[PDB]
Design a protein around this ligand. Structure first.
Ligand code: SUO
Ligand code: SUO
Ligand code: K
Ligand code: K
Lengths: 439, 439
């Protein structure tokens, strides 16, 4: 089995609305001008570079945006364009909420269970409700349709609907998930990280804890994860209060390694010890606050890196350009590179558009371990290669603007462009009529 | 046009699970033995008694409980009886959450807009998401089906689906709604009360504010309420922090009267002044903390009373027994009764089972103003009369238990009793296959 990366193709309504309290990047860049075309191309370049380097790469399409059905649910009626106009004038803030390209961060799309960890031997995917943020909670229904259109062989894949939409069951998916072990194909140890749980007072006081333990346990159940291969750990409330809104902003796993900050978890010593006694050859690379502060981790996203495995067993860290621009962080990463451990190469990518909204390399990808047989069962139209890379770039040049602001979301033209764009894209990716506007 | 009262028929799984933080009665009675059959009878006696007194009355049935579909959505699979078992053994607390008789409090089923207040001249009903509490949020889908089976004539009734299930749009329906004006059939002034709103620092700090202004404004749009007959007002946060989880625990309206506690609203003086200027004949009856403390207000449910109009214009207060059993409150009520004002009669009902979970006379009913023609359009099988009364009592005698504890919710027998009872009830009330288990 190999770990295949599925990246989100940035949607054409990508803009900065500062909709995520707790996500300092989102808040900080509120109202800045975005570049949808550049954002999409930046992500496609990373996808292609990794694919050309031999790492299985795939793509997940953007959603229908602006999403008029939700506006109708909010009390606005008439034709699509009439609704758009009514809202732009009466409640413009709702326009932004239904026009976010947020589904691009597929690390939040679902939680994956490789067939080696499940009871029925199938690959399980449970859609994340993303209930904490309204603009993201809207994603689940379409994300479910997309996942079923991509992992469409029901004999090999089981897609489960998102958990009930309530704070008690807040779920953010793979971004709070981890998998440790030997080769990807062997049964692994799944680590679910949460920010709060009922009956526990240890919880953030400034920024919200989007993930609840209750949600994580339900996901573990849905994905039929062997109860002996599961472990739940609470994120350090202090780091969440400093900007770590998902575990992937403070820690990342791969094979036998867990690269994390010293302040990542609550009861960190106990967790590492438990993992040490349950995962053969487990190695924890812990970054001390003296070399990298929590504040520096949040601004650089060094932990939102992709930790890849090369054929020699050595690893490569995929990082956002901000890690190279911060003296202290670039210095540490190179110390790590030279240090005696699995990390033997650093790879940097420019994902400025995504980072401006709090999403780095890892946020843009969803890791799915697949056996040779299961890989062939995936919709081949979404697997990255020269043909898809060129087709997607041409598609982006045809429909994306190199400039967008919240004010442009009221442009009925943008609406029109987006519909046609997604119509063609669903054809290119052999997804069928997966979008609501297509039914 | 007349105001018709639709009451909730208590479900067979009525039990105390302390599931509602902020609802002190619920919290106070956690795990006490309940009496489903008695709870049902108490409610029907109030329905029948008001009907006999000349007040149009109707009924809304309970829901499917335990609700197995939600448990499966939570990860527990297998046949109905296997899920029940697994849950009881693995996570029994979920059993209570999916077995609550909470839909009985129909004051939270939806928000109503009579035809005299709407832009298209129809009766509008928008289902409440009840997003704040997980066990009640589960109600919306079935509540919508029930409302559509009762107000089926689409030329006269417009039922709208519940708002998106997110905290930003928390909606608790009619319990936070008010309608003032001359006669019921005349255009009235709708007063929407909310607990919080984005950007507003004024909010409760102890108990949650379940209703947001954003939701209120969205429902006003969905119900097509004439913009000049709508007013939004914030609940006094300090009273929410004392147990007023809904507006109907601190204030109640009827015709030109607004019976409320002095500490009910923020900027109350100005709110009442605005009402006096915009509502002809408006009369506020404020109870000062000196005469009735907020604590005694929440313990007796003085304001969760039903304020009814007598044929001669005078009014009657339908109260729960606690009001008569509390010397101080009973004293005030009698002073109010004697004093020169519209309140000329007091009527008390034993609703101990409902009150133990924080529901009084008003909580158990949903006010729906209907013209003669609209009244004729309502499903006739749900209107209260001797036939229906005797039929429902026999039904209760045949399927309801006299005792119930949380531990009993795991009994596959209870599941069967309920499914069968509802199947029979659907026929009696002529609702067709309205429940999920019937589909
Ligand atoms: N894994 C990274 C997710 C980033 C995402 N940002 C946003 O939704 C910001 C959108 C805006 O503010 O325009 C979030 O907060 O979940
Ligand atoms: N309008 C009053 C409704 C009372 C209801 N009680 C409850 O759901 C308590 C159920 C329990 O805790 O078993 C509520 O809190 O909304
Ligand atoms: K190294
Ligand atoms: K009086």
């Amino acid at each position: 089995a190999w770990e295949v990366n599925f990246d989100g193709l940035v949607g054409l309504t990508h803009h900065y609305a500062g909709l995520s309290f707790g996500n300092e990047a989102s808040t900080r860049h509120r109202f800045q001008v975005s570049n949808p075309r550049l954002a999409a191309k930046q992500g496609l370049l990373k996808m292609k570079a990794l694919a050309d380097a031999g790492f299985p790469q795939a793509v997940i399409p953007p959603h229908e945006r602006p999403f008029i059905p939700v506006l109708r649910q909010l009390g606005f009626s008439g034709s699509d364009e009439q609704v758009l106009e009514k809202v732009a004038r009466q409640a413009p803030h709702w326009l932004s909420s239904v026009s976010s390209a947020s589904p691009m961060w597929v690390a939040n799309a679902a939680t994956i269970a490789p067939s080696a960890d499940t009871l029925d031997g199938k690959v399980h995917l449970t859609v994340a409700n993303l209930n904490n943020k309204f603009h993201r909670s809207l994603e689940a229904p379409v994300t479910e349709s997309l996942l079923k259109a991509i992992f469409n062989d029901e004999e090999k894949f089981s897609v489960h609907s998102a958990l009930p939409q309530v704070a008690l069951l807040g779920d953010e998916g793979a971004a709070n998930h981890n998998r440790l072990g030997g080769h990807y194909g062997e049964p692994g140890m799944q680590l679910f990280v949460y920010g709060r749980e009922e009956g526990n007072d240890t919880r953030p006081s400034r920024y919200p804890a989007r993930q609840t333990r209750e949600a994580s346990e339900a996901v573990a159940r849905l994905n039929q994860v062997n109860p002996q291969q599961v472990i739940f750990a609470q994120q350090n409330p202090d780091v969440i209060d400093q900007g770590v809104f998902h575990n992937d902003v403070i820690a990342v796993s791969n094979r036998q390694v867990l690269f994390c900050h010293q302040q990542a978890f609550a009861r960190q010593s106990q967790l590492l010890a438990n993992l040490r006694a349950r995962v053969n050859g487990f190695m924890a690379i812990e970054v001390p606050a003296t070399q990298v502060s929590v504040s520096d981790t949040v601004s650089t996203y060094l932990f939102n890196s992709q930790l890849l495995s090369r054929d020699d067993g050595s690893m490569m860290l995929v990082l956002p350009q901000e890690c190279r621009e911060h003296a202290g962080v670039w210095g540490y990463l190179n110390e790590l590179l030279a240090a005696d451990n699995p990390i033997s190469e650093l790879k940097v990518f420019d994902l400025r558009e995504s980072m401006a909204n709090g999403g780095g390399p890892a946020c843009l990808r969803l890791r799915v371990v697949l056996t040779e047989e299961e890989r062939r069962a995936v919709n081949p139209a979404v697997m990255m290669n020269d043909t898809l890379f060129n087709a997607l770039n041409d598609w982006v040049d045809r429909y994306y603007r190199d400039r967008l602001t919240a004010a442009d979301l009221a442009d009925p033209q943008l609406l029109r462009e987006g519909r046609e764009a997604l119509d063609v894209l669903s054809q290119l990716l052999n997804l069928g009529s997966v979008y609501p506007f297509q039914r």
